[PDB]
Ligand binder design. Structure first.
Ligand SMILES: *[C@@H]1O[C@H](CO)[C@@H](O[C@@H]2O[C@H](CO)[C@@H](O[C@@H]3O[C@H](CO[C@H]4O[C@H](CO)[C@@H](O)[C@H](O)[C@@H]4O)[C@@H](O)[C@H](O[C@H]4O[C@H](CO)[C@@H](O)[C@H](O)[C@@H]4O)[C@@H]3O)[C@H](O)[C@H]2NC(C)=O)[C@H](O)[C@H]1NC(C)=O
Ligand SMILES: *[C@@H]1O[C@H](CO)[C@@H](O[C@@H]2O[C@H](CO)[C@@H](O[C@@H]3O[C@H](CO)[C@@H](O)[C@H](O)[C@@H]3O)[C@H](O)[C@H]2NC(C)=O)[C@H](O)[C@H]1NC(C)=O
Ligand SMILES: *[C@@H]1O[C@H](CO)[C@@H](O[C@@H]2O[C@H](CO)[C@@H](O[C@@H]3O[C@H](CO)[C@@H](O)[C@H](O)[C@@H]3O)[C@H](O)[C@H]2NC(C)=O)[C@H](O)[C@H]1NC(C)=O
Ligand SMILES: *[C@@H]1O[C@H](CO)[C@@H](O[C@@H]2O[C@H](CO)[C@@H](O[C@@H]3O[C@H](CO)[C@@H](O)[C@H](O)[C@@H]3O)[C@H](O)[C@H]2NC(C)=O)[C@H](O)[C@H]1NC(C)=O
Ligand SMILES: *[C@@H]1O[C@H](CO)[C@@H](O[C@@H]2O[C@H](CO)[C@@H](O[C@@H]3O[C@H](CO)[C@@H](O)[C@H](O)[C@@H]3O)[C@H](O)[C@H]2NC(C)=O)[C@H](O)[C@H]1NC(C)=O
Ligand SMILES: *[C@@H]1O[C@H](CO)[C@@H](O[C@@H]2O[C@H](CO)[C@@H](O[C@@H]3O[C@H](CO)[C@@H](O)[C@H](O)[C@@H]3O)[C@H](O)[C@H]2NC(C)=O)[C@H](O)[C@H]1NC(C)=O
Ligand code: NAG
Lengths: 126, 466, 466, 126, 466, 126
């Protein structure tokens, strides 16, 4: 156990080495307190499954760092590679990048991974 | 070089402000002891947790002890446990007859906090009664709607609500509870001395679980709450407003001692079929007023330091302590429970006589001295949660009750604005056990993790065949 | 070209028709105030769902309203919540004493579907009764089980089964409800108006949720619901058999007004250890029989237009319209809740005046005219769901009780078949709350998505490592 | 949202363009009613996993459209391929292909993909 | 050969024994009939299983019939279900009254274990109690609290606890019970048949569900249960300690009949609203006594075959089968649930007559012989779970009350040890329903599958690009 | 159907063919008794997903067999390969390999597969 959240305040670089440690912690564990206890685990499991599906949708299944073919935009950020990766925490970077939540997501869903799957279908068609 | 490319990092460290239900993590040994247990319950989990804490460093964020919802979560949890933990137990209903009250005549004297009263009940056979008697402390027992004779009396409750005797197993020991969070959430602590209830915390840890909280219920004095950090601290939702509570930890604890020395004898009547019941029978005579004790030395020399800290938010001006604003003894007493027996102790003797806090440094050391004594009433019909919850009946315990506690914090308000010239004066507040919970929970908050984060890198993409 | 190849597709569009549980979604604004709404309690999800639809095009399937088990599910949901709603509350049981009875002596007169009665109860004190009186409707209070004395009576029910007075907070609003299905099902609308309760619905939509259904209870009339903007649509599981129930949709809302012109002061008696029974006291000088109103041509010309549908669904003959032929007031009157009290009206007068349903076209059309006025019983002891669910006493309401609704459809049968030679009759019908549900739900169906499918195609292969 | 089965009334060729959106919504959010409410979502979760596992069993994990190596049997059908793709709906096709349920499935599992995995096993021992 | 490499395998056939909840798997058919059925309510699982047994081969592991917590599972479940089944029904509280008692005048004689009593009860009207009478089985009826009048009695339980009259739909019908396991667990069956319940079972199967258990709480006999596999097997946790229970399983059944040879007639009283009591009314006139039957031949021949094997555990020493160790008839008699007319039979006649448990082989052959007949008590009030659960009152049943069973085994001990020189004694026993459970469950154990593993193999690498 | 557990008495090599059969059994099935049932089912589902995640973390998602990139240690075992595959059962091998539970698993996470994923990210960075 290298510490759950144990690199949060560091560089993106640092955090990227830890991802499994946190990923595993996402998913574990006369009266009706049992309903409360069940309801929580059904919430946790349901949530986890949402995001596994979103990795399926972006074709980032079965990995924890995953590349695509979509370019960046300066409107998303002008700050260079180091001015993120060497310079800040994810706890900051999310609050920076939040504007393109949904945007990048849908842009991936179809125009990346479905388009890869269109191209791959046409490759499978030989 | 090149443009950057969208890449997916799973499992990114990040969190958001959030709300959730939480585990009731417990001492495991209590589950062996009683069939139900009052806390550490049969409904809670004997996970009996390891105290895992990780100091983060570099990161900082706000804590807010007023807005932290767990105050209310625990308030609901407690009362929710209360009703279910009583619901099967024996009911006063068949006992609600006209009472023939009389003096508590005992061994060349009387039990003057009490009446002796006579009454009847159904036997187990529905078609028979006989006559039976018990003592009671005066507050529960009120004259009949007219005194056609003055001996005509009733229990206080029946014109409003039925009440239940506690099943004797359900012993009111506030056994420590740890709060803990389900997966995808985490708990943050403000491990930061002189954090003052709001704003950023300079230093943060993650924990799976809290320190064990003792859910003691008390009106004016925090009993057995945790030992505060370094020096006395003042917390409020608004320092400036006298109409908002001021909560104060002592730094060092102060001892408090109590007894009903009066040697009460347990007695029973079979109130119909299919129940069993208890009430105060005889007294073995050496009768005293029920009472509690605190050493002046410690108490004064504490109030001194507290006054000095108040002056560091109230410059130069003299600060004093004064009796309760009055009304119901449900507000004016320090009320508390030990061994299951209830107590209602007066504080008007305690909060008095204050020079300027800075000048009280003139005392600050002496040879040791006797206790102040606080005068205590008794009652056995109760309306637990400052008048809410069920009507509840406390059985008398056998004889000698002696019990002890540590004072570690106060509920106060500054009084209404007179001329106030170089002067301010304060009283014990009415309080809420929410604020008794705040007195502990101030240094916690709960958050949810959102483990995705999109980002740039010069990954040379994943083209077909890559 | 090549062999065809098996290829797997996920999330494919195909389904099957099947049974399931559903969510009670609600308008979110209720449970601010209406904890224990008698139907759609705070257990229903505060939602106000977005009413999204796609009319599919090219879809081809049959519907059958009489087989949508949501009808039954709703009937279960209702009755479940009914029994939930009454559980907290107080029984009539202690009030089941001998009743000594007299008149509603008010304004030098009396109310002849009522009686006055006199009785004893305990105070909060078990040994202490006193004496009191109240008024009741004659269906509430039956002459006593032995013929000793004309002035002696009892509660109607108490020789069989205890019943509760509803607690005052528990709320009788038949609010709009949304049914919505859980993931992997969907709701299908038959948008194919002119769908006659069975057949190919040529025109179907996906929807995520229903419109706001109201659970209005009724006995012969359909209210506040399924306006058929197409036609006065007439339906049954088989119109060709008089053993079946008949539904009519009105083409338009037809208003009804109803009044208690009888103005009670609520008598309120403390019984037992803090419970209050509510009853009829003195009456403010509005003192006449309860009744309801609709205009004659409104009623008539509708029944004529109904007759057109009846001589479209039957060959030409002289159908007539007539009273409900037998049973108690529950069957034979129309019955409603007037937003408080329960009403039992003279629809046996309303079903009259009739020539051949269609050939009332001998009039066809006319100017507007006065209200047909229907007398109504009121009563407060109810075996609610045709004896199903808990029996209840409705507490009375003081003051200015009067109410209004729309007729939006009808429940009928034909009459018994004579030789029926060019002649027939039809009558208002008692039925089930299921028939209200059929009339309100026919246009919905629930299906199970199967996302899996395999197909031939010439993906020439997925060769090893391709 | 395109709505559940937003191209039902459309050709199987057309339907293949829509799949990500239809797939996303196979997973979504004093009384005992809590039992009923949970039981429904638990049932939904259960079906979702049975599918995922099955797709893994066929060597068709991740991809919403998966090519196989199983050649057809004319007994399943022998109509022209455009009748299937370019003309009929899924809502037709299912009623025809349903005969060969299990028949196709066991083959995909074993003598196809488990045998592909036996070959991969032996190829990984090299 | 080659270098060895970590290789991961999933769905590996491996497991461990562990504790878990299990399913209430059952016949479906009774749920149409029997809402809150005494065993397998309408809410248990309509599995009616398919027995997909398979011996795995080369499979060898230790069973332990005394340590499988399914024994406790069945104990907790059946007890919890019992009280749950009886919560809906008739509380006898107001029937707890003075009894004036007299002759059960049947046939102008008396039924000598029964008596007659008169008392009063509430009609529906609270102020109107009235007189009536009932018959009772004597044992549950105790002379009143002071025996001033020899005609005065009460119900036995009144002073301790209330009691419940059961509902008709709470059927004491022992329909077959199965257990089955949730996925990731499986049930291993011992197929090393004639295995004796501890040690390695060398022949083992997967089963998805168990054989049909019958839960009837036979107190010293084992009834309608499993036969033994081939031998008349003895199982005990330690044969050499006489203080353990001993179990005999019979390979051949022995039939028994039981009867109330007297013709009861039902009688009833409307005790306030709703609660209709069931009394015994008349008995149509004959004064036989309730009894059960067995032939000396079958019994002796069984006991000989047993006594041969028992004296091969206990070398030749003359076993004598013998009457009770003593205590209450409610412990020491044999008891049964036939018709709910709970029997308490003369075990004391039956365990007798015995020469050396082996050397009765010197007898071992006779012609046919008539049944030994055990007279019995019948009674109506039971504290079901040998001291826990609700107090139950069994309704009397009119008419024939006669039934048949198979003896399937015995619960015994060896007697207290004298010098035992070529001598021993044995006595009937009745410790726990767990003993009836042990008598079935000895041949199942429950494992949890652990499907992950790794191995060395020549998997040279999953090289990059490979 | 070969039966559940249908090769446990076999050598590991012999049994290793069966996996799809065993895998398909891993996930199926006025009162409180619904509690007993949900409290079973929402144990089972979670147990399954913990393992799927672990197979994810090692880069073995979907497939019932997966080779690694790590060689053996004599401390893990030092016996001949035919004792393992060609002789002992899985229930028998379990008794040995039990030792290096956690030890091998954390190695498979980090120093194996996260190092493979670092190499892969570095190759993606290129
Ligand atoms: C050991 O195993 C034996 C069977 O091998 C059990 O003995 C049987 O027990 C059942 C109950 O479990 C007995 O059932 C009762 O039979 C009465 C007679 O039924 C016959 O006659 C009527 C007409 O008189 C016919 O209609 C009927 O079809 C039969 O031909 C019934 O009158 C009883 O009715 C009551 O119970 C039923 C439900 O069973 C209700 O629906 C009724 O309303 C009513 O309340 C009842 O059905 C059966 O007779 C027994 N047979 C024998 C030979 O004994 C033992 O109980 C069992 N013992 C142990 C220790 O487990
Ligand atoms: C807290 O302390 C007070 C003050 O000691 C206790 O009660 C009583 O308080 C009043 C002033 O508020 C005192 O003054 C007056 O006394 C005369 C006596 O004849 C009386 O007629 C007046 O009505 C008024 O009460 C009174 O002396 C004082 N009593 C005592 C015994 O001190 C109070 O009891 C303490 N609080 C609690 C909860 O006990
Ligand atoms: C701790 O206890 C001491 C007493 O042991 C308290 O001392 C207080 O000291 C001041 C003077 O130093 C006293 O002031 C006097 O008050 C009267 C009335 O206003 C006035 O007439 C005099 O001229 C003078 O100002 C004060 O009365 C005295 N109090 C007592 C109870 O003796 C000290 O204040 C106590 N600390 C706390 C926390 O109150
Ligand atoms: C709904 O209809 C029934 C049936 O008509 C109403 O009850 C009364 O029923 C009789 C027929 O059995 C009606 O006809 C006759 O009226 C004359 C009046 O002089 C009388 O001499 C006959 O003995 C016979 O009663 C009677 O008119 C009718 N009463 C009323 C007020 O309609 C029933 O009352 C109707 N429902 C309601 C709520 O009024
Ligand atoms: C089950 O066994 C008990 C204990 O044996 C039965 O009660 C009676 O117990 C006595 C010994 O305490 C037995 O022995 C003697 O019998 C002769 C008979 O003439 C008598 O003179 C002695 O005073 C003494 O009672 C007696 O046989 C035995 N009675 C019976 C009928 O067994 C108990 O009755 C047995 N259970 C049932 C339901 O009968
Ligand atoms: C099964 O039934 C037979 C009788 O049908 C029982 O036979 C027992 O047989 C032995 C001889 O083999 C008898 O022993 C002798 O008894 C006399 C008189 O007490 C004694 O003087 C001799 O020294 C010798 O011990 C034994 O009495 C006889 N028992 C009876 C009660 O007849 C056999 O015991 C029965 N077995 C069971 C399981 O009950
Ligand atoms: C370790 O492996 C050995 C050799 O097979 C075995 O005897 C032992 O039980 C295992 N112990 C543990 C702790 O896994």
């Amino acid at each position: 156990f290298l510490g759950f959240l144990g690199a949060a305040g560091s560089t993106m670089g640092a955090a990227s080495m830890t991802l499994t440690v946190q990923a595993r912690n996402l998913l574990s564990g006369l009266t009706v307190w049992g309903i409360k206890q069940l309801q929580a685990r059904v919430l946790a499991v349901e949530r986890y499954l949402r995001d596994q599906q979103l990795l399926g949708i972006w074709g980032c299944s079965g990995k924890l760092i995953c590349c695509t073919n979509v370019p960046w935009n300066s409107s998303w950020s002008n700050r260079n590679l180091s001015e993120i990766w060497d310079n800040m925490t994810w706890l900051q970077w999310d609050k920076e990048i939040s504007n393109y939540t949904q945007i990048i997501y849908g842009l991936l869903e179809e125009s990346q991974n479905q388009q890869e799957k269109n191209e791959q279908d046409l490759l499978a068609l030989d | 070089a090149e443009n950057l490319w969208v890449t997916v990092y799973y499992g990114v460290p990040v969190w958001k402000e959030a709300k959730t239900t939480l585990f009731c993590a417990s001492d495991a040994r209590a589950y062996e002891k009683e069939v139900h247990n009052v806390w550490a319950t049969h409904a809670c989990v004997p996970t009996d947790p390891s105290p895992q804490e990780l100091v983060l460093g570099n990161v900082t964020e706000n804590f807010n002890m007023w807005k932290n919802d767990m105050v209310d979560q625990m308030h609901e949890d407690i009362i929710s446990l209360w009703d279910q933990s009583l619901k099967p137990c024996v009911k006063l209903t068949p006992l609600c007859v006209t009472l023939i009250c009389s003096n508590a005549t005992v061994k060349n004297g009387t039990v003057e906090e009490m009446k002796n009263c006579s009454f009847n009940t159904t036997t187990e056979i529905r078609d028979k009664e006989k006559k039976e008697y018990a003592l009671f402390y005066k507050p529960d027992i009120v004259p009949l709607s007219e005194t056609n004779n003055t001996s005509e009396y009733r229990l206080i409750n029946c014109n409003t609500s039925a009440c239940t005797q506690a099943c004797p197993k359900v012993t009111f020991e506030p056994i420590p509870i740890h709060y803990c969070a389900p997966a995808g959430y985490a708990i943050l602590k403000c491990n930061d001395e002189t954090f003052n209830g709001t704003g950023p915390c300079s230093n943060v840890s993650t924990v799976q679980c809290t320190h064990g909280i003792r859910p003691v219920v008390s009106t004016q004095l925090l009993l057995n709450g945790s030992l505060a950090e370094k020096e006395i601290v003042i917390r409020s939702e608004n320092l400036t407003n006298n109409a908002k509570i001021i909560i104060v930890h002592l730094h060092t604890p102060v001892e408090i001692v109590c007894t009903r020395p009066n040697n009460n004898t347990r007695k029973s009547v079979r109130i119909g079929p299919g129940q069993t019941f208890y009430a105060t029978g005889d007294i073995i005579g050496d009768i005293k007023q029920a009472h509690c004790n605190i050493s002046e030395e410690k108490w004064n020399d504490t109030l001194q330091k507290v006054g000095i800290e108040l002056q560091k938010h109230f410059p130069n001006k003299t600060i004093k302590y004064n009796q309760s604003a009055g009304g119901d003894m449900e507000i004016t007493t320090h009320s508390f429970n030990c061994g299951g027996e209830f107590f209602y102790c007066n504080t008007s003797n305690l909060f008095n006589g204050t020079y300027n806090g800075t000048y009280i440094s003139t005392n600050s050391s002496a040879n040791s001295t006797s206790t102040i004594t606080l005068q205590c009433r008794i009652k056995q019909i109760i309306n637990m949660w400052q008048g809410v919850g069920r009507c509840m009946y406390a059985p008398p315990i056998a004889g000698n009750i002696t019990c002890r506690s540590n004072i570690t914090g106060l509920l106060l308000t500054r009084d209404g604005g007179t001329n106030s010239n170089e002067t301010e004066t304060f009283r014990p507040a009415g309080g809420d056990m929410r604020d008794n919970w705040r007195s502990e929970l101030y240094k916690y908050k709960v958050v949810k993790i959102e483990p995705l984060g999109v980002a740039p890198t010069r990954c040379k993409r994943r083209v077909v065949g890559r």
